[PDB]
Write an enzyme that holds these catalytic residues in place. Structure first.
Site, mmCIF file in Angstrom:
data_model
loop_
_atom_site.group_PDB
_atom_site.id
_atom_site.type_symbol
_atom_site.label_atom_id
_atom_site.label_comp_id
_atom_site.label_asym_id
_atom_site.label_seq_id
_atom_site.Cartn_x
_atom_site.Cartn_y
_atom_site.Cartn_z
ATOM 1 N N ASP A 35 0.840 -1.199 0.000
ATOM 2 C CA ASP A 35 0.000 0.000 0.000
ATOM 3 C C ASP A 35 0.877 1.252 0.000
ATOM 4 O OD1 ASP A 35 -1.878 1.978 0.341
ATOM 5 O OD2 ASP A 35 -2.604 1.273 2.286
ATOM 6 N N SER A 199 -0.242 15.538 -12.278
ATOM 7 C CA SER A 199 -0.458 15.155 -13.663
ATOM 8 C C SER A 199 -0.665 16.388 -14.533
ATOM 9 C CB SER A 199 -1.672 14.232 -13.783
ATOM 10 O OG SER A 199 -1.939 13.922 -15.140
HETATM 11 O O1 LIG Z 1 -5.109 0.012 2.164
HETATM 12 C C1 LIG Z 1 -5.982 1.084 2.539
HETATM 13 C C2 LIG Z 1 -7.129 0.547 3.400
HETATM 14 N N1 LIG Z 1 -8.175 0.072 2.461
HETATM 15 C C3 LIG Z 1 -7.681 0.398 1.109
HETATM 16 C C4 LIG Z 1 -6.727 1.568 1.313
HETATM 17 N N2 LIG Z 1 -7.403 2.880 1.517
HETATM 18 C C5 LIG Z 1 -7.222 3.865 0.639
HETATM 19 C C6 LIG Z 1 -7.930 4.869 1.124
HETATM 20 C C7 LIG Z 1 -8.075 6.251 0.468
HETATM 21 O O2 LIG Z 1 -9.425 6.726 0.573
HETATM 22 C C8 LIG Z 1 -10.325 6.042 -0.195
HETATM 23 C C9 LIG Z 1 -9.922 5.122 -1.160
HETATM 24 N N3 LIG Z 1 -10.866 4.429 -1.921
HETATM 25 C C10 LIG Z 1 -12.226 4.674 -1.720
HETATM 26 C C11 LIG Z 1 -12.621 5.594 -0.764
HETATM 27 BR BR1 LIG Z 1 -14.451 5.917 -0.501
HETATM 28 C C12 LIG Z 1 -11.681 6.281 -0.008
HETATM 29 N N4 LIG Z 1 -8.510 4.470 2.244
HETATM 30 N N5 LIG Z 1 -8.169 3.297 2.441
#
Ligand SMILES: O[C@@H]1CNC[C@H]1n1cc(COc2cncc(Br)c2)nn1
Length: 330
Positions: A35, A199
């Site tokens: 991540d 970008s």
């Molecule tokens: O590895 C982290 C925990 N789970 C996936 C990752 N993550 C990313 C984020 C950024 O914010 C959002 C991202 N995508 C949809 C939304 Br509604 C909000 N938050 N968590």
């Protein structure tokens, strides 16, 4: 030193990617979500509340002869997507595809939110954003890449995510056979702790390129491509029958549609996301309405180049004294 590991989509929609990681002595192999949008390495563990574990492989620190409890250290993370986890901290040996770090902070989950429980394929997260975002208290801890960086041949790692296919995370070297053309590098701001860049613009399908600055982050931990409402409206206007659904929570489109590609700019270079990368399938089982892979960032508050965008590129996370980001077609 270098390391190389294969990363695999967790399902047929490329909702996320898992990479095997060896923890402890003897090794306990867990499949972690690499991540670049967070900075904690945390794992399902023997300490996780039993009702919150459902199929995951757990780390058992008592069975690792190199594990040591970090006295008084706790962690708690609230992610932008509403999920969360928390626990205590051990230090242990961690290896990724031949690359080994001793004394890595391994954050052991006592609690995880429902979205983590319901995903049996992800045993934890390995954060690759900047260490200023690490949540361990009262003493912040360093990421795996930060700990390994000085020993790597080059202070870099690369993300090569596959579309419906395996991919690769490399540490310490750039595989010049893994991309076409040249890598274009672009400036990074670390002020929010992200791999944040600007970008140079976008195009929809075969349309004219629109030169406009889009500040966003390169985030392997986010599934979709989140962009300003003006840009996302311009894309879905080219899909007959697409509309933003308040009940679904974003743009949906008739599953029979052929999606146009989406191009984003990296300096003078261009990365082309094929149309089918933007198809995330029926909104519910059996539905003929499909969820779009490009969505407005208005609710999130930040633009996110997630997996939909990054998997169209070979991506260099350059952790030199002044960090930069590199993109190549592939
Ligand atoms: O590895 C982290 C925990 N789970 C996936 C990752 N993550 C990313 C984020 C950024 O914010 C959002 C991202 N995508 C949809 C939304 Br509604 C909000 N938050 N968590």
């Amino acid at each position: 030193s270098t390391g190389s590991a294969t990363t695999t989509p967790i399902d047929s929609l490329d909702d996320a990617y898992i990479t095997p990681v060896q923890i402890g002595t003897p090794a306990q192999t867990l499949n972690l979500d690499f991540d670049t949008g967070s900075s904690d390495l945390w794992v399902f563990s023997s300490e996780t509340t039993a009702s919150e574990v459902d199929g995951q492989t757990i780390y058992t620190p008592s069975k690792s002869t190199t594990a040591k409890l970090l006295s008084g250290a706790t962690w708690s993370i609230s992610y932008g997507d509403g999920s969360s986890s928390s626990g205590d901290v051990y230090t242990d040996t961690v290896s990724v595809g031949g690359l080994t770090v001793t004394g890595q902070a391994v954050e052991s989950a006592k609690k995880v939110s429902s979205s983590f429980t319901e995903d049996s394929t992800i045993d934890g997260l390995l954060g690759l954003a900047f260490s200023t975002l690490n949540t361990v208290s009262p003493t912040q801890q360093k990421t795996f890449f930060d700990n390994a960086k000085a020993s790597l041949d080059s202070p870099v790692f690369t993300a090569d995510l596959g579309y419906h296919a395996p991919g690769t995370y490399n540490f310490g070297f750039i595989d010049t056979t893994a991309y076409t053309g040249s890598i274009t590098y672009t400036a990074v701001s670390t002020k929010q702790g992200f791999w944040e860049w600007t970008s140079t613009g976008y195009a929809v399908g075969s349309g004219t390129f629109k030169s406009t600055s889009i500040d966003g982050i390169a985030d392997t931990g986010t599934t979709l491509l989140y962009l300003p409402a003006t840009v996302v409206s311009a894309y879905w206007a080219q899909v007959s029958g697409a509309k933003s659904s308040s009940s679904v929570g974003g743009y949906v489109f008739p599953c029979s549609a052929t999606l146009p590609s989406f191009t984003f700019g990296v300096g003078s270079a261009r990365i082309v996301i094929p149309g089918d990368y933007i198809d995330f399938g029926p909104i519910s089982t059996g539905s003929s309405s499909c969820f779009g892979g490009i969505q407005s960032s208005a609710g999130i508050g930040i633009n996110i180049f997630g997996d939909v965008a990054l998997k169209a590129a070979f991506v260099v996370f350059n952790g030199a004294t002044t960090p930069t980001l590199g993109f190549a077609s592939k």
